[PDB]
Design a protein around this ligand. Structure first.
Ligand SMILES: *[C@@H]1O[C@H](CO)[C@@H](O[C@@H]2O[C@H](CO)[C@@H](O)[C@H](O[C@@H]3O[C@H](CO)[C@@H](O)[C@H](O)[C@@H]3O)[C@H]2NC(C)=O)[C@H](O)[C@H]1NC(C)=O
Ligand SMILES: *[C@@H]1O[C@H](CO)[C@@H](O[C@@H]2O[C@H](CO)[C@@H](O[C@@H]3O[C@H](CO)[C@@H](O)[C@H](O)[C@@H]3O)[C@H](O)[C@H]2NC(C)=O)[C@H](O)[C@H]1NC(C)=O
Ligand SMILES: *[C@@H]1O[C@H](CO)[C@@H](O[C@@H]2O[C@H](CO)[C@@H](O[C@@H]3O[C@H](CO)[C@@H](O)[C@H](O)[C@@H]3O)[C@H](O)[C@H]2NC(C)=O)[C@H](O)[C@H]1NC(C)=O
Ligand SMILES: *[C@@H]1O[C@H](CO)[C@@H](O[C@@H]2O[C@H](CO)[C@@H](O[C@@H]3O[C@H](CO)[C@@H](O)[C@H](O)[C@@H]3O)[C@H](O)[C@H]2NC(C)=O)[C@H](O)[C@H]1NC(C)=O
Ligand SMILES: *[C@@H]1O[C@H](CO)[C@@H](O[C@@H]2O[C@H](CO)[C@@H](O)[C@H](O)[C@H]2NC(C)=O)[C@H](O)[C@H]1NC(C)=O
Ligand SMILES: [Fe+3]
Ligand SMILES: [Fe+3]
Lengths: 348, 348
C-alpha cells in the first residue's frame, strides 16, 4: 500500500503511464481500461488508486464514494504572487465553436445539425450543451436533436457514434479514449475543423492552442482564428476573443479522484511526483515530463502548469458546485447509467 | 429513466409543458401530438408516460391497457374539511346550454338544429348527449341528427366539422386541440356565444366561469348568465342556477392515465408536483402554477384544487362506473374509432 496504482484510459495513456512508473522508482504503478467508467470501477474494486478526470466523470466517481484530491491549474492572469500549488483555481469556459464559413448557424438553429463532442458525460463536450438543449426543448430526446454527432461512449450503432471515425484502421469506433480520432477536447475540434460536424463543444483553451500555428499537427497548423466563430446563448455570433460573453457556462477544472482512505497518501505522492516530473521539475525535460504528451493531452491536460490543493476537504458536490451538480442531475433524469445504478445501492 | 414524459395535445398545451419541465428540473418532460388519441398511442409505445384525459378518452386508453393514476378534484360544498387529495371525487354535470333569446328550442326540438360539442368521444360534448339521442331516435344516424355541428375530432370533410372555425388563419379546422376556436369546454361555449351554434354540450361549471366577467377573454368578458338557459330531458328550460335539476348526466372527473408499469412513479412525481406548483404550491405563481393556463384548461382544468388519490389500483371500468361504460359501449356500436378497433383484442 506504499505505491499509487494510476489508472490509464487507452494504450497511448498506457505507454505515457509506464514511462512515469519506470522513472518514479515504482513510487507510481499503472493499471489500464478501455473507458474512464471502467477505470473508476477499478479504483472502487481497489485494483487502482487514482486518476485525473473531467468534472462530469468526477460526478460519476463522486456518486460511487470517491473524493477529489488535487485540481489541474493553468496559466493565470491574476494573483501571480501565490505559488502554482497555492494559487486558487479559475475554471475553464465551455463554449460552442462553429466555422465562420457556416452562415445562419446560431444557438436557435442547432436542431437537426451535426455535432462534435469531447465525449458522453464530459462537462464541456456533453453535460453543459445537452443539459441546456434538453432544458430549453423540455425533451429528454437529446439522442434525436443533432441529425448526426460524434460522442465517444454513446451506443456505437446510434447516430451519436455515426460521425466518429475510430483509429487509423477505423476499428473500435466511438471508444472514449485517445484511440478515437475525434476523442477528447482536441478530437471534437479536429471534427469541426475537418468539417465532419457543423458545431463542436469544447473549452476556449482548445481554440487558441490549435489555431494560428500554435499546433504542429497536420490538421491544426494552417488553421486561422477568423475562420471560427462562437455561438452565445443570446443567439448572437461573436469572435473567439469575446469568450467571456460567448461561453455556455463556467466548468470546474479537471481533478484527481481516489478512495476516501487513500486520498492524503496520493495527495503527498503526487505533490512530490510533480516537483520531480512537473512543468518545473528536476527531471523535465531531462528524464520524464508528466504534463506533456504530444497534443494527445494524455493522463493530464498539456495546458496544466501544476496540480493544486483544495481549501478544506471538499465533497465531489462542493468542488463541482451546487449549480453544476444540479445541471448534471437534471440531464441524468433522461438516461440510465449502469455504473451510477450499481454505486447507488452498492456504496449507499 | 426517472423523468416523467407528459403528453401535450397541441402547441398551447406543449408551451405550458416545456415550462413545467424547466421549473420541475426535468422531473417532467414533453411529448406533443395534434390529437389526444395520438397522445394515447405515444403512451402505449413508451414515447410519453402519462397525460390528463376526459372520461371518454379514459375508455379509449382503458381499452388499450392504460390505467388511471389520479383524478382531478374540485372545490366541494359537502365535507369541506378533508385534505383535497383524500376528499372523494364529487363528479360533475353534463348540461345542454342554449341562448334564452332562441324560442321554442327544447330537448325535443333539437332535431335538425346546429350543435357545439367539446370534441368527439368526450363525455359532456359527445358520449352522453349523442348516447341518449340515439337511444331516443332508435336510429344510429347521429351523423345526420344536427343540420351542421362543430365536433372537433370528427371527419373534417363532414357536417360535424362544418361549424369548426380553426386557428387564427382558419387552418387545422376541427383538429381536437385548443388551436381550434371551439375545441374543449371553453370552445363549445364561445361557439354558442357567437351564435355559430344553437346548443352547446358542456359541463355545469363552464357557464359560470365565462359569464359575469369571471373571464377577461374578449369573447367572454361581456357575457351575461341571464342570456343562457339549460335544456332538460323533461323537455323544459331553466336558468344556470337550476343545473342540479336541468343536467343531462353525472360525468366522472378528468384523470391522469399511464401504462401499468409506470403508474406508481407518475403518481409519486405528480403528488410532489402539485405540492410545489399546485393551488397552494410554494412556487405558485412565484415560478409556475400547474392548474392555471388562461381559462384555456391546458393539460389540466383550471377549476382543479388538486389531483386526488383513488381507491386501490382501479380499472377504467371501476373509475368510470359500470353505468357510464355501458352507455359509451352502446353509442360505440353505432360507429367505430381506429384505436378501439386496433386494441379490442386486449380488453376481450
Ligand atoms: C340506452 O343507453 C343506456 C345508457 O345510456 C343503456 O343502459 C344499459 O343498457 C343495458 C342493456 O344492454 C342494461 O342491461 C343496463 O342496465 C342494467 O344494469 C344492472 C345493474 O343494476 C345490470 O345487472 C343489468 O344486467 C343491466 O345491464 C343499462 N345501464 C343502466 C345503467 O341502466 C341502454 O342499453 C340503452 N337503451 C336503448 C334502447 O338504446
Ligand atoms: C481561453 O483560453 C486561452 C488559451 O489558454 C486564454 O489565453 C491565454 O492567456 C494567458 C494569460 O492570462 C497568456 O499567458 C501570458 O504569458 C506571459 C509570459 O509568457 C505573461 O507574462 C503574461 O502576463 C500572460 O500571462 C497565454 O499566453 C494565453 N495563451 C495563448 C496561447 O494565447 C484565454 O484567456 C481564454 N479566454 C478567456 C476569456 O478566459
Ligand atoms: C424533482 O426531483 C425530486 C423528485 O423526487 C425532488 O427531490 C426530493 O425532494 C424531497 C423534498 O420533499 C427531498 O428531501 C426530503 O426531505 C423530507 C424532510 O423534510 C423527508 O421526509 C424526505 O424523505 C426527503 O428526505 C428528497 O430527498 C429529494 N429526493 C432526491 C433524490 O433528491 C425534487 O424536489 C423535484 N424538484 C422539482 C423542482 O420538481
Ligand atoms: C355549478 O357550477 C358552479 C361553478 O362551478 C358551482 O358554483 C360554486 O358553488 C360552490 C359551492 O359548492 C362555491 O364554493 C364556495 O366558495 C366560497 C367562496 O367563494 C366558500 O366560502 C364556500 O364555503 C364554498 O366552498 C363556488 O364559489 C361556486 N363557484 C362559482 C365560480 O360560482 C356550483 O356548485 C355548480 N352547481 C351544481 C348544481 O353542482
Ligand atoms: C432552463 O431554461 C429556463 C429558461 O428558459 C430556466 O428557468 C428560468 O431561470 C430563472 C433564473 O433561475 C428563473 O427564475 C425563471 O423562473 C426561469 N424562467 C422560465 C421562463 O421558466 C432554467 O434555469 C434553465 N435550466 C438550467 C439548468 O439552466
Ligand atoms: Fe473538461
Ligand atoms: Fe369532460
Amino acid at each position: 500500500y506504499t505505491r499509487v496504482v494510476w489508472c490509464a484510459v487507452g494504450p497511448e495513456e498506457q505507454k505515457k503511464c509506464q514511462q512515469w512508473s519506470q522513472q518514479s522508482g515504482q513510487n507510481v504503478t499503472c493499471a489500464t481500461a478501455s473507458t474512464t467508467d471502467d477505470c473508476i470501477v477499478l479504483v472502487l474494486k481497489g485494483e487502482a488508486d487514482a486518476l485525473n478526470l473531467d468534472g462530469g466523470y468526477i460526478y460519476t466517481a463522486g456518486k460511487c464514494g470517491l473524493v477529489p484530491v488535487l485540481a489541474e491549474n493553468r496559466k493565470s492572469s491574476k494573483h501571480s504572487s501565490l505559488d502554482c500549488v497555492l494559487r486558487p483555481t479559475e475554471g475553464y469556459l465551455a463554449v460552442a465553436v462553429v466555422k465562420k464559413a457556416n452562415e445562419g448557424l446560431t444557438w436557435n438553429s442547432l436542431k437537426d445539425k451535426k455535432s462534435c463532442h469531447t465525449a458522453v458525460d464530459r462537462t464541456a463536450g456533453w453535460n453543459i450543451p445537452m443539459g441546456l438543449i434538453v432544458n430549453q426543448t423540455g425533451s429528454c430526446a437529446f439522442d434525436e436533436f443533432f441529425s448526426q454527432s460524434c460522442a465517444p461512449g454513446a451506443d456505437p450503432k446510434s447516430r451519436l457514434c455515426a460521425l466518429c471515425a475510430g483509429d487509423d484502421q477505423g476499428l473500435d469506433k466511438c471508444v472514449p479514449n485517445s484511440k478515437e480520432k475525434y476523442y477528447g477536447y482536441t478530437g471534437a475540434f479536429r471534427c469541426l475543423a475537418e468539417d465532419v460536424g457543423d458545431v463542436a463543444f469544447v473549452k476556449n483553451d482548445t481554440v487558441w492552442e490549435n489555431t494560428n500555428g500554435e499546433s504542429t499537427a497536420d490538421w491544426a497548423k494552417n488553421l486561422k482564428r477568423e475562420d471560427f466563430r462562437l455561438l452565445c446563448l443570446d443567439g448572437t455570433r461573436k469572435p473567439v476573443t469575446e469568450a467571456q460573453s460567448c461561453h455556455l457556462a463556467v466548468a470546474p477544472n479537471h481533478a484527481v479522484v481516489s478512495r476516501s482512505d487513500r486520498a492524503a497518501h496520493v495527495e503527498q505522492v503526487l505533490l512530490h511526483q510533480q516537483a520531480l516530473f512537473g512543468k518545473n521539475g528536476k527531471n523535465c525535460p531531462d528524464k520524464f515530463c508528466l504534463f506533456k504528451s504530444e497534443t494527445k493531452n494524455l493522463l493530464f491536460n498539456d495546458n496544466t502548469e501544476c496540480l493544486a490543493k483544495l481549501g478544506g476537504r471538499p465533497t465531489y458536490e462542493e468542488y463541482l458546485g451546487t449549480e453544476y451538480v444540479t445541471a448534471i442531475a437534471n440531464l441524468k433524469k433522461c438516461s440510465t447509467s449502469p455504473l451510477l445504478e450499481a454505486c447507488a445501492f452498492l456504496t449507499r
